[PDB]
């Protein structure tokens, strides 16, 4: 997207979200990142939402195909096709974070956001891998993100909370550590609860929304 203005890429990404054209949205935000300037809070969310939708559809298709595969060579071949496509999207996101979003991210808000993304897309890679190094790459990204968020953000910060939510899902679904997942979700929920009294009504709504996701998982896991 080298010939389009940065601002035009951002505006078209917003249009593609409204039209549910998430591949277009991801392509627009990839071109925006490749302009070389750092991303604002809003632009980070556009980047995240775009690729989360694209890879989410790939993961959902991969699970359908893998389920049929478990239950000629066509099923395996086509699952391999979707798997390769998924890994390509994950590799593209990881490449944007490595070149050069993370190294230019100095504020805690931006750095935790990019490191949480990095943990997520190694996690998605780990879901289809057949593997230990990919799992450890996810763990390492999540861990650095947690260490920063616990030093630099209040317990109710939505990025901190969503990071802990996904790290707990990593522990449960990927690392075969359900007890660590349950412990992380409960401690995150309890510290957030104790910090709600500091929030305005709108921040209270953001935080209690994600806290409920933590509770939903705990209800499922216990």
């Amino acid at each position: 997207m080298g010939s389009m203005e940065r601002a035009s890429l951002i505006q078209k990404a917003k249009l593609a979200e409204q039209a549910e054209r998430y591949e277009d949205m991801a392509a627009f935000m990839k071109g925006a990142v490749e302009k070389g300037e750092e991303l604002s809070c809003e632009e980070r969310n556009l980047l995240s939402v775009a690729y989360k939708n694209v890879v989410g559809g790939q993961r959902a298709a991969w699970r359908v195909l893998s389920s049929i595969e478990q239950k000629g060579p066509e099923v395996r071949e086509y699952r391999e096709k979707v798997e390769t496509e998924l890994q390509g999207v994950c590799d593209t996101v990881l490449g944007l974070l490595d070149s050069h979003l993370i190294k230019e991210a100095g504020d805690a808000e931006s750095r935790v956001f990019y490191l949480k993304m990095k943990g997520d897309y190694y996690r998605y890679l780990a879901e289809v891998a057949t593997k230990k190094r990919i799992i450890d790459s996810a763990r390492s990204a999540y861990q650095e993100a947690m260490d920063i968020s616990k030093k630099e953000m209040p317990p109710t910060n939505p990025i901190r909370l969503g990071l802990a939510l996904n790290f707990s899902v990593f522990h449960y679904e990927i690392a075969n550590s359900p007890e660590e997942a349950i412990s992380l979700a409960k401690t995150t929920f309890d510290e957030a609860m104790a910090d709600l009294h500091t929030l305005s009504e709108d921040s209270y709504k953001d935080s209690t929304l994600i806290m409920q996701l933590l509770r939903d998982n705990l209800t499922l896991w216990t």
């Binding site: 939510l165 994600i210 996701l213 998982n217 499922l220």
Partner: peptide, 6 residues
């Protein structure tokens, strides 16, 4: 088990 919908 639900991650951030996002």
């Amino acid at each position: 088990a639900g991650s951030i919908p996002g």
